[PDB]
Amino acid sequence: ATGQDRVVALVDMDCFFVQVEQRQNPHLRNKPCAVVQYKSWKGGGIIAVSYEARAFGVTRSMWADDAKKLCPDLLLAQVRESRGKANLTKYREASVEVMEIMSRFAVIERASIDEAYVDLTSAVQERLQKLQGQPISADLLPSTYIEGLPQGPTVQKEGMRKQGLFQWLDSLQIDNLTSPDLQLTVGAVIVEEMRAAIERETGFQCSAGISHNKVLAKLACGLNKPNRQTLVSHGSVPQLFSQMPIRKIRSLGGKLGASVIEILGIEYMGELTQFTESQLQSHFGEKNGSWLYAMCRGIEHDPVKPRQLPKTIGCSKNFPGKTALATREQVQWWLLQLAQELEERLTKDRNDNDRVATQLVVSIRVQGDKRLSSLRRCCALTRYDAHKMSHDAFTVIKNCNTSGIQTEWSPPLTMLFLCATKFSAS
DNA sequence: ATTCTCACACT
DNA sequence: AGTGTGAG
Numbered sequence: 378a379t380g381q382d383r384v385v386a387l388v389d390m391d392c393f394f395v396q397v398e399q400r401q402n403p404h405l406r407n408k409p410c411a412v413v414q415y416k417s418w419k420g421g422g423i424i425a426v427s428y429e430a431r432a433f434g435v436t437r438s439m440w441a442d443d444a445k446k447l448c449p450d451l452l453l454a455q456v457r458e459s460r461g462k463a464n465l466t467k468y469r470e471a472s473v474e475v476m477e478i479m480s481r482f483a484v485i486e487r488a489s490i491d492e493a494y495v496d497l498t499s500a501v502q503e504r505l506q507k508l509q510g511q512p513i514s515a516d517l518l519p520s521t522y523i524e525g526l527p528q529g530p531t532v533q534k535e536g537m538r539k540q541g542l543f544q545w546l547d548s549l550q551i552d553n554l555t556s557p558d559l560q561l562t563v564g565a566v567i568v569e570e571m572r573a574a575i576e577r578e579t580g581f582q583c584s585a586g587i588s589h590n591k592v593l594a595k596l597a598c599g600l601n602k603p604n605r606q607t608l609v610s611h612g613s614v615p616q617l618f619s620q621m622p623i624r625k626i627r628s629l630g631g632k633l634g635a636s637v638i639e640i641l642g643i644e645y646m647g648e649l650t651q652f653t654e655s656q657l658q659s660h661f662g663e664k665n666g667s668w669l670y671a672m673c674r675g676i677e678h679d680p681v682k683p684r685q686l687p688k689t690i691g692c693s694k695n696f697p698g699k700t701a702l703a704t705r706e707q708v709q710w711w712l713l714q715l716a717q718e719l720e721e722r723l724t725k726d727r728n729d730n731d732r733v734a735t736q737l738v739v740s741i742r743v744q745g746d747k748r749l750s751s752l753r754r755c756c757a758l759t760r761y762d763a764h765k766m767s768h769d770a771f772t773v774i775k776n777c778n779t780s781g782i783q784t785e786w787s788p789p790l791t792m793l794f795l796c797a798t799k800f801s802a803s
Numbered sequence: 804a805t806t807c808t809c810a811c812a813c814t
Numbered sequence: 815a816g817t818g819t820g821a822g
């Protein structure tokens with residue numbers, strides 16, 4: 378009822394794509410470097426930045442050319458392109474390396490290519506018996522921060538982390554195997570081993586957050602990045618939330634979180650607490666207001682889905698500006714290339730994960746429209762065959778063509794999207 | 804001119 | 815089925 382039933386962790390690879398390239402290209406280790414795609418336009422678009430390049434101001438979405446302006450010594454690894462489009466195979470396969478290690482300790486929800494939530498509730502219960510009732514040495518937690526500690530009556534980072542960890546472990550009630558703080562602590566000892574196993578078995582370093590739910594875990598993980606883990610206890614939530622901007626909380630990063638700020642006239646997550654649940658529901662709907670009411674008291678029940686494998690496999694490409702596709706055979710040729718990349722990933726999925734997709738979603742964007750997708754249409758995926766898929770995807774879109782000429786496409790297409798869905802056992 | 808995934812609520 | 819939001 379105080380949102381302390383579970384022990385949940387979120388593990389997040391540090392500058393992941395960069396690390397995959399650094400393990401592979403030793404010359405890039407401990408240097409400012411980014412991973413780019415499409416070198417031709419403004420040197421390439423940056424999709425990942427090491428921590429040494431972040432110190433210079435280089436960010437994602439920046440053009441490599443522009444990053445070179447902020448950081449002249451910046452080293453670049455460019456993504457493999459296949460069929461004219463960026464190919465992430467290398468990163469997906471490094472990701473499977475980690476997911477399989479993590480999955481030896483507890484059941485995982487894959488959250489992205491490089492983050493995963495862990496429910497440690499049963500594992501913690503198993504260790505709490507094996508541990509008799511003996512103290513938890515600080516040597517079990519060599520990279521753990523305790524959020525909100527030290528407090529009360531050293532000038533270097535490692536000095537502060539130790540003191541906070543000392544105070545936490547001192548006031549720790551190791552005789553009471555049902556106290557939620559002691560469970561987080563044992564969750565944190567498990568994440569330490571999990572993280573040591575990941576770095577040993579892959580060379581990949583990661584940060585992690587430990588708390589009682591997914592949202593507090595995600596936030597905690599970002600508090601002491603890179604290569605560290607943060608425990609956030611229920612007790613720390615009032616002070617943590619009291620100056621936490623609303624947009625930092627997962628799902629509040631967008632238009633909803635902006636309405637909360639404007640409608641309620643607040644800036645910080647802790648300001649939500651003064652409102653009744655019914656007031657929050659009248660403003661944002663039953664589900665959103667219920668969710669906010671509990672979340673601002675550190676309580677959320679969205680759980681760790683037992684799911685390590687994506688649910689849709691999709692292939693898309695943007696054609697911005699003067700590169701928009703304007704002729705029918707252009708559209709035909711790119712749909713083919715997408716279906717091919719899509720085929721290559723579907724058959725690898727059928728062999729590894731014992732399933733087949735059964736519906737083909739095709740989406741397109743017309744020059745002049747506003748939104749991610751202009752139009753969605755679907756059809757049957759019966760055969761993993763690139764030429765049928767592209768033939769079928771064209772068929773279910775050819776009548777979007779406002780043009781009167783057969784050979785031309787108007788309005789020209791600025792995005793093409795093919796997505797396999799509705800998997801079944803095989 | 805970032806681009807590219809993937810998930811889910813609502814209808 | 816098709817649209818819209820959110821996040822990595």
Ligand SMILES: O=c1nc[nH]c2c1ncn2[C@H]1C[C@H](O)[C@@H](COP(=O)(O)OP(=O)(O)OP(=O)(O)O)O1
Nearest residue numbers: 389390391392393394424425426489491602807822
């Ligand atoms: O806006 C984005 N547009 C396209 N792709 C994106 C975007 N944002 C994240 N991604 C994908 C690829 C990225 O390599 C991976 C890791 O994302 P993410 O955890 O936010 O950053 P990161 O691992 O590169 O470094 P860090 O964790 O230290 O912030 O997610």
Ligand SMILES: [Ca+2]
Nearest residue numbers: 389390391392
């Ligand atoms: Ca990351």
